[PDB]
Every structure is written in structure tokens, then in C-alpha cells.
Amino acid sequence: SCFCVCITGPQWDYRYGNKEQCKKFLTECEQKNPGAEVEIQC
């Protein structure tokens, strides 16, 4: 099970899911938020 993160200033988003869902989360993070701080760990 993976943990992934998309931080945009004071809005902090997190997901717990499988690797496919966390890869999707980071792709969406990047499309919406080019400057986000990110993490994936599985």
C-alpha cells in the first residue's frame, strides 16, 4: 500500500492507495499544481 502527497502552500492533499492510484495522484498533482511538493512511498 502506498502513501502519496501533493502540497500546495496551505492546502495539503494526501492519498493512501495502490501504486496505480498514487501514480495517478501525482500525475493529477503535476497537471494542476506545477509547483507542488510531492511524495510517493510504497
Residue 23 makes CB contacts below 8 A (sequence gap 6+) with 40
What is the gyration radius of the CA atoms in the chain, in angstroms? 9
Residue 31 makes CB contacts below 8 A (sequence gap 6+) with none
> CB-hemisphere CA count at 13 Å for 27?
6
Domain ranges of the chain: 2-41
> What was the resolution (in A) of this experimentally determined structure?
1.1
SS3 27: helix
